[PDB]
Structures are given as structure tokens and as C-alpha cells.
Amino acid sequence: GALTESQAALVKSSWEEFNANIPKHTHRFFILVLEIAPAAKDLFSFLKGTSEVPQNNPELQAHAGKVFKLVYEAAIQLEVTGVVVTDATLKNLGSVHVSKGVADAHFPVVKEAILKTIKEVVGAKWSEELNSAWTIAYDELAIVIKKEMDDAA
Numbered sequence: 001g002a003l004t005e006s007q008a009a010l011v012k013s014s015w016e017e018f019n020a021n022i023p024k025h026t027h028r029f030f031i032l033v034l035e036i037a038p039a040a041k042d043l044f045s046f047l048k049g050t051s052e053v054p055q056n057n058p059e060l061q062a063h064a065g066k067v068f069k070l071v072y073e074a075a076i077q078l079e080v081t082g083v084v085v086t087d088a089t090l091k092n093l094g095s096v097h098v099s100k101g102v103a104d105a106h107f108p109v110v111k112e113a114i115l116k117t118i119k120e121v122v123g124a125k126w127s128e129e130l131n132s133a134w135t136i137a138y139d140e141l142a143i144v145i146k147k148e149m150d151d152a153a
């Protein structure tokens with residue numbers, strides 16, 4: 001709907017399971033990115049000039065771990081305040097994405113790689129409600145990001 005408390009619980013819950021195996025889950029996210037849009041590889045500094053996604057890279061792990069953390073925090077924020085607040089960081093994030101060649105048409109790619117990751121993290125605990133909670137948070141965070149991008153360009 002607009003993030004109920006049982007929806008926020010599920011995001012936090014699946015988020016903690018994700019965090020439990022960063023090496024594994026973060027490698028798996030970039031696999032799902034590249035399965036969707038193989039052309040995206042080149043945008044990523046730690047993937048460029050590599051054949052396969054690295055499995056024990058600290059840069060990949062740090063990046064993909066931050067990404068998930070910000071969707072999960074966006075979802076708590078929506079639950080609690082009703083909105084996503086734009087701060088310096090999301091302003092900062094807009095200029096970096098503009099610097100790296102990210103367009104609005106790229107957002108659906110990372111959104112589906114994140115849904116598929118989480119589905120594999122929770123396994124049998126997956127529900128259509130968890131799915132809609134991550135969807136809402138991602139979508140609300142991208143809208144903020146996208147305008148900070150559109151203001152940087």
C-alpha cells in the first residue's frame with residue numbers, strides 16, 4: 001500500500017538474512033544484473049575488464065551491500081514518516097550516477113536483480129507481500145534519486 005508495519009518487518013527481516021552472507025548474496029546480485037542486461041557490465045568499475053563476476057572482491061561487496069542497505073532504510077523511512085527524505089547523500093548519489101552514465105532506463109534492471117536476489121535469500125519464506133514491500137521501497141527511492149540526477153544533468 002504505502003508500507004505497513006508488517007511490510008517493514010519483512011523488509012528488515014529479509015535484509016538481515018541478506019547481510020548474513022554478503023559474499024554470496026552480493027556476487028549473486030551482479031550475476032542477475034548481467035543476466036538481465038549484459039551491456040551493464042561496463043558501467044561498473046570493479047567488473048570492467050573481468051570475464052566473470054569476482055567472488056571475493058571487497059569493492060563489489062561494499063558497493064552491492066550499500067545499495068541493499070539504502071533500499072531497506074528507504075522502506076523503514078516510508079513506514080515511519082510516509083515519505084523518503086532527500087538529504088546530501090541522495091543528492092550526492094544523483095551526481096555520481098550522472099557521472100557514471102546511468103539513465104532513467106537503467107532503474108528497472110537493478111530493480112529486478114534485487115527482487116530476484118531477495119527471493120533466493122529467503123527461499124521458502126518468500127511471499128507476495130515481501131515482494132511488494134521491496135518493490136515499493138525501490139520505486140520510492142529511485143524517484144528521489146532520479147530527480148537528483150535530472151538536476152545534476
Ligand code: HEM
Binds near residue numbers: 040093106
Ligand atoms: C535506488 C536504486 C539505486 C541505489 C540505492 C544506488 C546506490 C548506489 C550507491 C550507494 C553507489 C555508490 C555511491 C558512492 O559512494 O559513490 C552507487 C554507485 C553506482 N551505481 Fe547505483 N544505485 C541505484 C541504481 C543504479 C542503477 C540503475 C545503475 C545502473 C545500472 C547504477 C549504477 C551504478 C554505478 C555504475 C555506480 C558506480 C560504482 C563504481 O563504479 O564503483 N545504480 N549506486
